[PDB]
Amino acid sequence: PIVQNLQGQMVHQAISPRTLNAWVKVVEEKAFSPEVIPMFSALSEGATPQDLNTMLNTVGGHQAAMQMLKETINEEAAEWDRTHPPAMGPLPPGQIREPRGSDIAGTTSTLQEQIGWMTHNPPIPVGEIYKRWIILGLNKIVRMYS
């Protein structure tokens, strides 16, 4: 995740195995119950899209759900793309390429990229965007199963 360094400037930290393990246990306990949604958000504070992916990809079992979530996400990405025409290049010196829908969901972007966007001035908030998409997919899963 990207965390506030108490001396200033936002810094990256490696995904936390503890946070992960607490999400995994939320999921094994509650079988897509509505309380998962706030817990997801509670444990994904400053998450990069790669972090979010790792969180979702580690949930053993529930393959149908996970694949329904993927579809909501891939849908939301496509829609974002259709609503945001790519900015005109050429890219100025020192700038990173702008993120498309697949970049935000972390499927075609690198961690370095995601780090650069989220730590840019001002941040380009790919983790928060993705997180909204994921929450939408979770809604759909909770409605299916609960």
């Binding site: 025409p85 790519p86 900015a87 005109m88 290049g89 050429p90 890219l91 100025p92 010196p93």
Partner: protein, 165 residues
Amino acid sequence: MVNPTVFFDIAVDGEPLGRVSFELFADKVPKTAENFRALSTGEKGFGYKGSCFHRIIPGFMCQGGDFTRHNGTGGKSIYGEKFEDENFILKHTGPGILSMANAGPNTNGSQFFICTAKTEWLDGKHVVFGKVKEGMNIVEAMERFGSRNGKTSKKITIADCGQLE
């Protein structure tokens, strides 16, 4: 001649600044060259005459050719819609390189940019298709009107353009 020569007479809030001429590399990128050539003569009924350079970033490049919306959102090629990256043989080796602006692969329209420094990081991404022949100093004067975000301080127009040689 296989490679055409085109000119732009540049104006600043309507006052003439000077002439910039360009060699077009029809011998390496014929389709891209003939697009700019044709847009410069107005022979299809539309093109660069009267348009503006809407983004200029000093030390980087001067960008124009959006003759339909004047802001980077328009432009059109003579092909009846965006066209493919012809090749990436020619490199952005220094000031005066002329190259196609784009919003991603295979989306060449009419927007182009004139480099004012070497821009290596564009190689493989923007099709290089010409170079300034006379008037580099005019391009450098244009950079005086730009800013870090590209917004220009004065209206920089192609008051006239066509073919020479």
